[PDB]
Amino acid sequence: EGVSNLVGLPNNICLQKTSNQILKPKLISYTLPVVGQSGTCITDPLLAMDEGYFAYSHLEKIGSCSRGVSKQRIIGVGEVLDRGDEVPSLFMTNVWTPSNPNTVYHCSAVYNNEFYYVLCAVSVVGDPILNSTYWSGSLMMTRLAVKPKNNGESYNQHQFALRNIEKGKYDKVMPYGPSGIKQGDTLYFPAVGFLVRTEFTYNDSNCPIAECQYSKPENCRLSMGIRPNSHYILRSGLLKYNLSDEENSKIVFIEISDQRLSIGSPSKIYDSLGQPVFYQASFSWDTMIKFGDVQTVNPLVVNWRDNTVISRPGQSQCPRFNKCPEVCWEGVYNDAFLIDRINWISAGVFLDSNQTAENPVFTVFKDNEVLYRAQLASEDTNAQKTITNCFLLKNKIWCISLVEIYDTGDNVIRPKLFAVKIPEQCT
Amino acid sequence: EVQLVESGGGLVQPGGSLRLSCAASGFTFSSYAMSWVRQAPGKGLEWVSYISSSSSYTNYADSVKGRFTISRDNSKNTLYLQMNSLRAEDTASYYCARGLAGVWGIDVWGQGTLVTVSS
Amino acid sequence: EVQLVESGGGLVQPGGSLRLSCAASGFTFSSYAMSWVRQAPGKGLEWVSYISSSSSYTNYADSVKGRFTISRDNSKNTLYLQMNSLRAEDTASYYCARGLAGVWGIDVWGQGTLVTVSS
Amino acid sequence: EVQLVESGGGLVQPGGSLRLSCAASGFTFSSYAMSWVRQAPGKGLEWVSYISSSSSYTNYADSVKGRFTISRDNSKNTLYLQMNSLRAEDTASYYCARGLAGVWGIDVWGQGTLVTVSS
Amino acid sequence: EVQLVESGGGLVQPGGSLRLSCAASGFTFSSYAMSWVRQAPGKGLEWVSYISSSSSYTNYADSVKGRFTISRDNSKNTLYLQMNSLRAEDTASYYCARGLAGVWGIDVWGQGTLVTVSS
Ligand SMILES: *[C@@H]1O[C@H](CO)[C@@H](O[C@@H]2O[C@H](CO)[C@@H](O[C@@H]3O[C@H](CO[C@H]4O[C@H](CO[C@H]5O[C@H](CO)[C@@H](O)[C@H](O)[C@@H]5O)[C@@H](O)[C@H](O)[C@@H]4O)[C@@H](O)[C@H](O[C@H]4O[C@H](CO)[C@@H](O)[C@H](O)[C@@H]4O)[C@@H]3O)[C@H](O)[C@H]2NC(C)=O)[C@H](O)[C@H]1NC(C)=O
Ligand SMILES: *[C@@H]1O[C@H](CO)[C@@H](O[C@@H]2O[C@H](CO)[C@@H](O[C@@H]3O[C@H](CO[C@H]4O[C@H](CO)[C@@H](O)[C@H](O)[C@@H]4O)[C@@H](O)[C@H](O[C@H]4O[C@H](CO)[C@@H](O)[C@H](O)[C@@H]4O)[C@@H]3O)[C@H](O)[C@H]2NC(C)=O)[C@H](O)[C@H]1NC(C)=O
Ligand SMILES: *[C@@H]1O[C@H](CO)[C@@H](O[C@@H]2O[C@H](CO)[C@@H](O[C@@H]3O[C@H](CO[C@H]4O[C@H](CO[C@H]5O[C@H](CO)[C@@H](O)[C@H](O)[C@@H]5O)[C@@H](O)[C@H](O)[C@@H]4O)[C@@H](O)[C@H](O)[C@@H]3O)[C@H](O)[C@H]2NC(C)=O)[C@H](O)[C@H]1NC(C)=O
Ligand SMILES: *[C@@H]1O[C@H](CO)[C@@H](O[C@@H]2O[C@H](CO)[C@@H](O[C@@H]3O[C@H](CO[C@H]4O[C@H](CO)[C@@H](O)[C@H](O)[C@@H]4O)[C@@H](O)[C@H](O)[C@@H]3O)[C@H](O)[C@H]2NC(C)=O)[C@H](O)[C@H]1NC(C)=O
Ligand SMILES: *[C@@H]1O[C@H](CO)[C@@H](O[C@@H]2O[C@H](CO)[C@@H](O[C@@H]3O[C@H](CO[C@H]4O[C@H](CO)[C@@H](O)[C@H](O)[C@@H]4O)[C@@H](O)[C@H](O)[C@@H]3O)[C@H](O)[C@H]2NC(C)=O)[C@H](O)[C@H]1NC(C)=O
Numbered sequence: 001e002g003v004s005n006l007v008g009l010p011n012n013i014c015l016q017k018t019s020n021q022i023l024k025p026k027l028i029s030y031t032l033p034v035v036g037q038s039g040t041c042i043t044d045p046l047l048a049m050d051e052g053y054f055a056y057s058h059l060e061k062i063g064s065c066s067r068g069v070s071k072q073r074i075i076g077v078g079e080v081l082d083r084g085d086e087v088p089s090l091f092m093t094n095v096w097t098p099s100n101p102n103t104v105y106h107c108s109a110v111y112n113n114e115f116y117y118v119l120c121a122v123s124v125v126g127d128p129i130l131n132s133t134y135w136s137g138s139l140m141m142t143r144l145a146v147k148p149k150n151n152g153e154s155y156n157q158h159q160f161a162l163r164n165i166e167k168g169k170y171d172k173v174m175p176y177g178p179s180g181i182k183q184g185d186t187l188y189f190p191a192v193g194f195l196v197r198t199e200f201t202y203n204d205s206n207c208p209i210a211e212c213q214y215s216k217p218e219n220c221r222l223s224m225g226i227r228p229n230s231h232y233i234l235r236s237g238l239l240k241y242n243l244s245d246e247e248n249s250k251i252v253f254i255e256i257s258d259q260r261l262s263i264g265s266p267s268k269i270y271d272s273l274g275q276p277v278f279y280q281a282s283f284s285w286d287t288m289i290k291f292g293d294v295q296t297v298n299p300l301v302v303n304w305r306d307n308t309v310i311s312r313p314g315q316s317q318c319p320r321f322n323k324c325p326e327v328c329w330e331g332v333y334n335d336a337f338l339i340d341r342i343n344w345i346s347a348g349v350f351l352d353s354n355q356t357a358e359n360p361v362f363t364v365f366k367d368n369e370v371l372y373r374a375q376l377a378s379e380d381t382n383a384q385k386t387i388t389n390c391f392l393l394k395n396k397i398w399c400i401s402l403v404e405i406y407d408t409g410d411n412v413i414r415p416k417l418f419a420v421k422i423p424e425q426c427t
Numbered sequence: 428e429v430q431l432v433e434s435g436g437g438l439v440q441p442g443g444s445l446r447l448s449c450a451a452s453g454f455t456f457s458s459y460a461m462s463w464v465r466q467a468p469g470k471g472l473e474w475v476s477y478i479s480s481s482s483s484y485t486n487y488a489d490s491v492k493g494r495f496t497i498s499r500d501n502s503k504n505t506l507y508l509q510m511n512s513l514r515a516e517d518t519a520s521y522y523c524a525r526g527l528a529g530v531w532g533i534d535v536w537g538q539g540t541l542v543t544v545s546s
Numbered sequence: 547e548v549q550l551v552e553s554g555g556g557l558v559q560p561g562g563s564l565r566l567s568c569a570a571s572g573f574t575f576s577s578y579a580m581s582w583v584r585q586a587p588g589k590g591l592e593w594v595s596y597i598s599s600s601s602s603y604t605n606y607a608d609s610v611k612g613r614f615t616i617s618r619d620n621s622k623n624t625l626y627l628q629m630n631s632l633r634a635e636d637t638a639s640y641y642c643a644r645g646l647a648g649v650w651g652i653d654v655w656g657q658g659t660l661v662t663v664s665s
Numbered sequence: 666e667v668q669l670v671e672s673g674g675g676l677v678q679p680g681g682s683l684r685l686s687c688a689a690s691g692f693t694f695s696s697y698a699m700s701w702v703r704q705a706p707g708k709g710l711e712w713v714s715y716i717s718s719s720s721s722y723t724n725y726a727d728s729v730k731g732r733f734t735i736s737r738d739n740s741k742n743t744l745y746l747q748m749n750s751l752r753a754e755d756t757a758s759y760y761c762a763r764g765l766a767g768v769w770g771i772d773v774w775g776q777g778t779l780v781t782v783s784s
Numbered sequence: 785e786v787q788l789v790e791s792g793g794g795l796v797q798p799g800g801s802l803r804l805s806c807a808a809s810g811f812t813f814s815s816y817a818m819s820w821v822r823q824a825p826g827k828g829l830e831w832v833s834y835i836s837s838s839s840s841y842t843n844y845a846d847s848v849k850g851r852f853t854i855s856r857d858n859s860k861n862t863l864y865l866q867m868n869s870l871r872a873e874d875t876a877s878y879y880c881a882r883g884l885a886g887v888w889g890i891d892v893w894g895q896g897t898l899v900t901v902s903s
Contacts, residue, residue, distance in 0.1 A: 032536045036469045037622055042530075056529065060471075074491065076529060082534045084454060091460060092529040095474070148484055360493075407620075408570070416531070554687075557794060591786070633741060641717045719868070720801060740797055 001279045001394040003052040003080045003088060006112055006273050011396045012424035014344060014364075014371060023362060023374035026419040027088040028400070034410050035267060041065035043381035045415045047387040047402040048179035048268075050111035052080045052147045054090045055118065055179075057107050058415065060203065065413060069176045077116040077144045080391065088393050090400065094144050096157055102408060106142075108175030108189045112243075113160035115158075115373035118142040119175040119189050119239070122161070127253055128174055132194055132232055137165070137172045139251065141241075161363035162241075162249035170195050171232070173253045176342040177267045178335075178387055181276050184299060185244035192233035192264035197225060202232055202261075202342060222284045226329050234264025236280055238300055257301045263288050263329065269294065270389075276301045285319060285325040289309045291336065291346060305344075310336075310365055313353045320354050332357055332383075337390040339397050339422055347422065349386040349401045350377065360381050360403050362420055372426065376418050381406045386412070390422070429453040431523055433507070433540040441515060449506040449523035449540075456504040462495065462527050463508050465542075467519040474528035475521075476508060486527070490516075492518055510542070518544045548572045548652075550642055552659040554627070560634055565655060566627040566634050568642035569613075575623040581646045582616065584661075586638040593647035594640075605646070609635075629661075629662050637663045667691045667772040673746075675780035678701055679753055685778055687744040687761035694742045700765045701746055702734065703780075705757035712747060712766035713759075724765070728754075748780075756782050786810045786891040787881055792865075794900035798872060804865040804897060806880035813861040819884045820854065820865055824839075824876035831885035832878075833865065843884065847873075866898075875901045 012024065039062050046057035057075040063069030078092035098104050105128060109121035119141040125131040144156035165173055170193040177190025200221075205218035226234040240252035265281035276294040282300075289307040289312075313320045318328035334347025347364045351357060360383040364371040377383075383404055392401035399422060404415045435447030447463070458480040465473045475485040476497035486496060494517075495510045506523050520541045524532045555567030566582070577599045584592050595604040595616035604616060613636075614629045625642050639660045643651045673685030685701070696718040703711045714735035715724040723735060732755075733748045744761050758779040763771050792804035804820070817838040822830055833854035834843035842854055851874075852867045863880050877898045881889045 018528055028533050029530065031530065032466070032472075032532065035622065038469075040471070058530070064537050074528065074530070076527070078529075089533045090531060092526050092531055093460070093526050150484060150487070152469075225553070631741070740800070 003082075003394075004392050005049075005051055005271070006390065006392060010392060011424045013345065013397065013422050013424055015345075016396075016426065017241065017369060017371050018427050019372070020427040022372060022423040024421055025362065025374060026087065026271050027416060027420075028083070028087075028415040029415070031340055031410075031414065037411060040065045040412050041068055042288050042404075042413060042415060043161060043384075044105070044402060045385055045387060045401075045402055046075075046109060046178055047105055047388040047417070048109040048111070048388060049080065049391055049400070050079075052180075052391070053111065053116065053143075054078055054080055054092075055109045055116055056090075056092070057109075059101070059104075072095060072097055073101050073104050075107065075118055075120075075142065075144075077146055078147060081394070086393065087333075088391075088398050088400070088425070090417070093146065094156060094256065096144055096150055103183075106176055108177055108191070108239075109143045109179045110189060112187070114141075114145060114147065116144045116146055117187060119241075121174045121283075127281045128190075129226070132172060135154065135172060137174075138162075139165075139173070148280055149421065160249075162251055163250055163410050165251040165253075167251075169199070169236065170255075173239060173251060174426055175395060176264065177269075177351075179268060179270065180238065181269050181271050181297070185242065187241040188269065188297075189239040189241065190267040190269060191237055191253060193237050193255060194232045195230065195235050197233045200224070207325055208323075209325055215324040215326060217325075219285060219327055219373075222327045223325060223329075224261075226263075228327055231276045236262070236264050236267055238267075253319060254298065254300055256280075259302075260286065260290065262290070265331070266333050268335050270337065272390075273341045275341070279329065279335045279337045281313055283329055283331040284356075285295070285318070285328070287314065287320060287322045287331070289334075289336070293338075293341075294358070300386065307365065307368065308368055309370060310350055310363070313351055313355060316355060333385045333387075335388055337385070337388050337399060338351070339390055339399070345371075347390060347399055347420075348388040349418075351383060351386075351405050357384060360405060362401065364420070364422075372423075376401075376403055376416075377405050382413070396424065429534040431534060431537045433521070433523060433538050435521070435540045435542065436539075437511070437542045439542075439544055440546075442512060443544070444541060445510040445513070447508040447510060447540060447542070449508075451504055451506070451523070457501055460525055461497075461499070461506050462524060463506070464522045464524055464526075464528065465517075466522070470519075471521065471532070472528055477527045477537075513542075513544050515544055518533055518542065535543040550653060550656045552640070552642060554640065554661065556657045556659065556661045558636075558661075558663065561631060562585050564629040564632065564661065566629060566640055566659060566661070568625040568627075570623050570642070572623070572642075576620050580616075580618075580625050580642060581643060582625070582640055583643055583647065584636075584638040585639045589638075591647055592618065593651075597647050619648070632661075634662050634663055635638075669695045669775045669781060671759070671776050671778040671783070673759070673778045674682060675756070675782065677751070677780070678784075679782055680750055681782075682782070683751070683780065685746040685759055687778075689742050689744070689761070695739055698763055698765075699735075699738065699744050700736070700762055701744070701759055701764065702728055702764075703755075703757040703761055705761045708757075711757070712765055732737045734748070750756060751780075751782050753782055788891060788894045790878070790880060790895050790897040792878070792897040792899065793859055794898050796870070796874075796899075797903075798901055799869055801900075802867045802870070804823050804862040804899070806865075806897075808861055808863070808880070817882060817884075818854070818856070818863050819880055819881060819898055820863075821881055821883075821885065822874075822876040822878045827876075828852055829887070830876070833885045842858065861881075864871060870901050873903055875899065 036129045044059040048055045062319040078246040083089045104120045110117045122138040122140050125134050140161045148156040172194040178193040180188040186195035208217050222228045231298045237255040262284035265283040267280045270277040278294050280290040289310045290331045292303040312321045314330045334350045336346045349362045352361050359379040387401045388401040399420045402417045407414045433449045448535045462477045463475050478497045482499045520539045522539050550567045555564045580597045594610045597616045597618045601618045617626050639658045671687045701714045711731045716735045720737045758777045760777050790806045820833045826830045832848045835854045855864045877896045
């Protein structure tokens with residue numbers, strides 16, 4: 001008995017499309033009363049899970065939830081055990097908070113032997129994805145153990161800043177994503193690359209504007225950056241960190257392939273059922289979900305899954321279900337964790353809206369059809385970012401998903417974590 | 428259903444010595460984590476003391492590193508806290524849960540216990 | 547759509563102390579009127595407590611003039627009622643609305659809360 | 666001003682069981698004496714049941730020595746009387762006061778309560 | 785098999801008056817000893833009364849020397865206890881047995897009776 005990841009052979013799960021709601025959403029984020037209300041706001045979440053250990057990060061803003069200030073950034077790890085009879089939850093054991101809250105942005109977590117590295121970005125100009133034209137480029141990786149001891153001083157918290165970067169053609173690197181993977185003694189972190197627009201090599205004739213009359217050909221080139229007249233085009237990739245040497249911090253940014261090349265978005269790679277599975281958000285011309293498995297670990301090449309039923313909403317410019325090139329940098333992060341490989345069954349909390357961001361619904365889809373859905377809230381509660389992770393509880397698959405919802409008696413976007421169990425028996 | 432019964436006292440002179448208690452029932456207390464969490468009207472969560480299952484690890488905050496020390500009495504399910512050398516900045520309602528500070532907590536906060544240090 | 551969610555306690559020993567609550571959403575609570583209305587099975591409306599917008603006027607009935615006192619929590623939309631020293635004649639379902647007694651009420655009574663005072 | 670609110674009705678079958686109640690307000694009920702006094706049309710005063718402040722002494726009349734037993738409810742100001750095994754000679758109006766029988770009385774008899782035992 | 789049936793009740797105002805009863809069957813009650821034993825959650829045995837067979841000797845504790853007096857009803861097997869002028873320190877579960885305080889007791893404590901004195 002034990003809380004492990006997707007390994008071996010789990011129990012048989014539902015393989016048919018049923019309207020009968022057989023999903024049981026269970027809340028494990030019971031908060032205390034918020035007597036003494038104010039302009040609080042919780043954003044920038046993070047949820048990683050591996051071998052029974054989790055992590056969390058958040059930036060509490062007092063005022064507006066976007067253009068606010070920084071007061072505290074609680075970054076902590078813990079263990080994953082059960083509440084009662086077949087009720088798993090997340091038990092936090094260690095908590096770390098930086099001195100100055102308005103320095104840390106865009107963290108990335110990873111698992112290790114008996115530690116939990118948190119690779120964050122350091123900036124003195126604010127949001128690096130908004131003022132990258134003056135960002136230095138320094139990166140900081142915080143190591144937090146999942147089991148502290150008495151009077152260690154070197155075993156509980158490890159504030160480490162990296163020195164060398166192997167940037168070949170990119171001008172700057174930054175950890176961009178919830179979590180990565182590892183192979184023995186080689187940590188990988190999701191990231192995005194900063195490359196000059198005038199130094200981009202992309203012929204403007206491979207753009208899918210053939211069956212897109214209401215789309216200009218240069219929309220592919222104009223969509224690779226945050227703005228048309230910008231100075232940097234984002235590029236997805238991964239950061240390599242070989243901790244088996246410890247002689248010099250190495251930062252190697254391995255860029256992604258050219259197949260369905262989109263703008264930089266929060267990516268998430270995880271080892272599901274042995275093979276590494278990669279995810280990439282859609283903040284570009286492509287509005288559908290970017291899913292697939294990885295065959296070459298170090299040379300990242302992801303076989304994209306052509307799902308036509310799972311997408312994300314947006315603004316009027318680029319709404320949901322849009323498959324033509326358009327200049328637009330918008331969307332919402334909604335990932336999914338792989339629960340089966342023989343049938344390629346995925347599971348994640350995806351929003352169901354055309355041009356709005358409400359009604360967070362957990363949906364299960366194999367490749368081109370939804371099997372069974374279940375609403376985690378009402379059809380009016382807003383939601384921006386969702387993080388989905390699945391594991392096992394001693395005989396069966398369990399999934400915990402962090403979904404920022406709008407609580408009634410809190411008046412603040414609260415990252416409520418819902419614990420959902422993959423149904424073995426269905427109608 | 429997990430029931431948390433907070434206890435203790437309040438209305439003490441600045442610099443006194445109080446002992447807060449919190450018993451529980453349901454989940455097996457022989458191997459689990461307990462933590463005292465306080466919150467003042469206007470502020471949010473504020474962790475003070477943490478202890479493991481086997482009483483092998485005891486963590487404290489920067490402001491209460493030497494004020495009180497949390498103990499464990501696994502034989503009789505409870506949670507003691509011998510608050511010593513408190514000030515006016517410690518006037519808040521204390522709560523016991525199964526998470527250090529976090530935003531976590533896997534059980535409804537039953538009643539709590541208010542501690543007033545003034546005059 | 548205005549939603550009135552009644553709450554509170556019931557099935558208590560006569561002479562105890564109950565605290566009925568009623569939260570609301572929608573209309574601006576910072577400036578409006580709230581009133582507790584009860585009705586026993588067989589009888590009609592019976593007003594007990596009234597609260598003003600700025601908490602400047604609090605009216606009570608002849609039978610509950612000194613039983614309980616209504617309060618106001620304009621910061622967080624709610625409606626408390628600290629019922630103290632109740633008798634067997636207070637066994638009824640309490641409701642919250644936007645009228646003192648009247649025959650008025652511009653919102654459907656959602657659920658209510660039954661208070662049983664017997665044995 | 667002392668107000669005595671008598672309650673309880675009549676119109677019961679011969680040999681039934683009625684329960685008369687009488688609440689009060691004003692004077693401190695925790696330490697005083699209460700007594701039921703009845704009077705039929707044509708006759709005068711007729712004491713039936715007496716009780717002390719600490720419920721240590723309970724006196725009754727020769728005709729109602731085993732009919733009913735007076736109790737005390739010092740928590741909630743009232744005066745119960747579980748009338749049991751009544752006859753046709755008990756058709757009268759009952760009253761509550763602060764004197765056993767006497768000719769005394771320290772408050773105007775407010776309303777009283779008539780009990781009819783016939784047919 | 786000796787069966788001890790405790791009775792009574794709690795939840796009374798501070799300074800009230802309660803009457804605890806405990807009947808028994810089996811052993812001959814006309815010549816034996818009875819004693820009330822209470823225990824609060826957290827503490828151990830604490831005797832409050834004692835009485836002989838012929839009601840010739842009645843022992844009490846230093847804290848309840850003038851609170852209540854134990855009686856005997858050898859005609860009808862029972863054990864009364866007219867608790868008077870109780871305080872908040874008397875909130876405990878009372879028991880009836882065949883030993884003053886001791887560590888003795890030749891019968892399984894059946895149900896007991898909890899008495900609560902608060903608010
Ligand atoms: C993206 O990043 C870039 C670079 O990382 C950011 O550009 C930087 O902006 C800051 C401004 O925040 C520049 O710093 C200095 O700001 C000074 C402002 O002084 C006060 O400004 C506020 C207003 O109060 C004053 O108002 C008037 C203004 O004249 C006064 O008369 C009045 O008395 C008040 O005092 C105050 O609230 C505040 O507290 C400051 O005290 C400037 O004075 C300063 O100018 C110097 O530098 C100039 C060159 O840039 C030079 O020509 C001047 O002569 C002078 O020496 C400077 O602007 C950073 O310098 C600037 N960086 C760069 C590289 O230019 C950008 O803001 C950021 N954008 C986003 C969206 O994040
Ligand atoms: C970036 O992307 C652009 C667009 O795809 C590429 O430019 C196109 O290249 C293709 C070749 O693969 C062109 O297709 C054909 O080009 C012929 C060129 O003629 C000469 O070709 C060689 C030199 O390369 C000479 O040796 C030879 O003798 C010829 O003189 C045209 O003749 C063809 O014309 C046919 O199509 C047109 C319609 O386009 C008809 O009107 C004609 O009648 C005929 O049927 C044909 O066009 C294509 O034209 C190029 N397009 C443009 C806009 O230039 C770039 O090469 C690519 N660059 C990189 C670095 O990848
Ligand atoms: C992260 O960083 C770590 C280092 O910190 C990397 O780990 C290194 O991986 C390389 C892989 O190439 C290891 O190199 C190995 O060295 C072996 C030497 O051991 C013994 O070799 C002789 C045996 O005969 C060999 O002859 C040839 C030589 O090529 C081989 O082909 C044969 O198969 C025989 O094995 C002995 O005589 C000698 O005395 C040595 O004892 C060698 O045998 C391996 O073939 C290989 O070249 C290197 O040792 C690793 N370093 C550590 C510290 O473990 C890791 O890969 C990095 N991760 C990345 C890049 O993702
Ligand atoms: C959606 O899928 C659900 C999958 O769990 C369906 O629930 C299952 O529905 C079937 C059909 O009704 C049940 O099978 C029957 O259950 C009854 C009742 O079981 C109870 O029995 C005793 C009371 O006698 C009670 O103590 C138990 O705890 C059970 O709750 C049995 O009497 C029958 O013999 C037969 O087994 C399943 O039991 C039920 N699943 C569970 C886990 O209960 C649901 O019906 C589907 N909904 C729709 C609309 O299709
Ligand atoms: C959410 O997004 C969905 C996808 O973007 C929306 O579905 C789309 O809705 C639009 C509505 O303008 C459709 O666009 C047009 O549909 C009408 C069809 O009506 C006429 O159909 C025939 C002609 O084919 C005509 O004879 C009839 O009399 C009708 O008048 C036509 O004008 C065009 O064919 C054009 O397609 C999309 O087709 C439709 N897409 C899909 C995939 O269904 C959905 O409406 C959105 N919902 C909300 C609430 O915003």
